Amino acid sequence: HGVCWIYYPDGGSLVGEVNEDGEMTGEKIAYVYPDERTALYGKFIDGEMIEGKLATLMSTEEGRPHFELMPGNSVYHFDKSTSSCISTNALLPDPYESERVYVAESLISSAGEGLFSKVAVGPNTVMSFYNGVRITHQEVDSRDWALNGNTLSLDEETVIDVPEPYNHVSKYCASLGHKANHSFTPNCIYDMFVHPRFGPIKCIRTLRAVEADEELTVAYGXXXXXXPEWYQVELKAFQATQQK
Ligand SMILES: C[S@@+](CC[C@H](N)C(=O)[O-])C[C@H]1O[C@@H](n2cnc3c(N)ncnc32)[C@H](O)[C@@H]1O
Numbered sequence: 750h751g752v753c754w755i756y757y758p759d760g761g762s763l764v765g766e767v768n769e770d771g772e773m774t775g776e777k778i779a780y781v782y783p784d785e786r787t788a789l790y791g792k793f794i795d796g797e798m799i800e801g802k803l804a805t806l807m808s809t810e811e812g813r814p815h816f817e818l819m820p821g822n823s824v825y826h827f828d829k830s831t832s833s834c835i836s837t838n839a840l841l842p843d844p845y846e847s848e849r850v851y852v853a854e855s856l857i858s859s860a861g862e863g864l865f866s867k868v869a870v871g872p873n874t875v876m877s878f879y880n881g882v883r884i885t886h887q888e889v890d891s892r893d894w895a896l897n898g899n900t901l902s903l904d905e906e907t908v909i910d911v912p913e914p915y916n917h918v919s920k921y922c923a924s925l926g927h928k929a930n931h932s933f934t935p936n937c938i939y940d941m942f943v944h945p946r947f948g949p950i951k952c953i954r955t956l957r958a959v960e961a962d963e964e965l966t967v968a969y970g971x972x973x974x975x976x977p978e979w980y981q982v983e984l985k986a987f988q989a990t991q992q993k
Pocket residue numbers: 855857858859860861862863898899900916927928929930931932979980
């Protein structure tokens with residue numbers, strides 16, 4: 750009857766008063782990120798973000814949230830990608846992600862850029878979002894493997910991709926999950942995420958506590974889709990660690 754909270758398994762949530770029809774519709778609805786603190790507050794229709802302004806969940810009293818707007822004019826809307834359009838605002842960063850990760854040269858030799866944590870956080874922490882264009886498994890599997898570096902399977906029907914030129918931060922920085930390099934001793938995994946802006950995508954989630962400026966890596970693996978040695982090299986070394 751009063752305030753409804755809808756939690757997703759990823760730890761994010763929708764919160765506000767429902768309308769006469771029991772829908773999350775109004776001007777005082779919020780999406781709350783998995784930190785249970787960073788929030789997008791404002792106009793939602795049936796749970797879908799029309800105009801969310803950056804906010805902080807300051808306190809909750811008997812399930813009733815108290816939000817304060819952040820300074821400035823950061824505004825967001827449900828903006829699900831398509832087969833060809835990655836975003837209506839490719840250069841508008843995600844504010845939760847901006848506080849937790851950054852891109853820099855990978856510490857892995859000859860591995861291009863990598864993703865690094867800004868913060869010390871514990872296990873199972875959502876750090877970053879893997880948004881991209883949505884394409885079929887047929888398109889990915891039927892093309893040259895060298896076009897599939899940024900592909901990540903979403904579900905039975907869809908593969909997410911971050912194709913050129915969006916693989917460059919100067920062209921696309923709305924999410925950064927695609928900047929995480931591979932490792933066989935990763936500190937992170939890809940995981941399902943339901944994002945108020947990007948819709949259903951995947952996220953990067955730590956497997957264990959990480960330190961500030963630690964590089965974030967994920968096991969990509971185990972044969973690449975479509976149609977490398979750096980994989981083969983580390984695979985062997987990883988194997989050796991298991992025996993005399
Ligand atoms: C999903 S992107 C990761 C970000 C990428 N390094 C960049 O600069 O945009 C995957 C690509 O990064 C490189 N890469 C990822 N892991 C690597 C590794 N362990 N060693 C060498 N290169 C790696 C490969 O070129 C791969 O195609």
